[PDB]
């Protein structure tokens, strides 16, 4: 049971690390979406030109 508790703590740490990685990936995706919106605004400016 002590070994199972240790394994559960390790699994919780791994899940926290995976959640942090997923949060960083979501932040990168949001930055990419903002860059795409800026590119769309530049395309609209080019259409006006």
């Amino acid at each position: 049971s002590k070994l199972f508790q240790f394994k559960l703590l390790q699994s919780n740490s791994k899940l926290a690390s995976t959640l942090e990685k997923i949060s960083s990936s979501n932040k990168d995706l949001e930055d990419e979406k903002m860059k795409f919106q800026e590119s769309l605004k530049k395309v609209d400016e080019i259409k006006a030109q």
């Binding site: 559960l8 699994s11 899940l15 995976t18 990168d28 995706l29 990419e32």
Partner: protein
Amino acid sequence: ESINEFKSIEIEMKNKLEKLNSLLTYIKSEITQQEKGL
């Protein structure tokens, strides 16, 4: 600029797929922690 925007949209779709895979893996790892109560 339009070609670059299309490439950026494709890269964003790939990154979103990777993030969805990572989120599914994290959800599986969190669901695998049900035995922590015992």
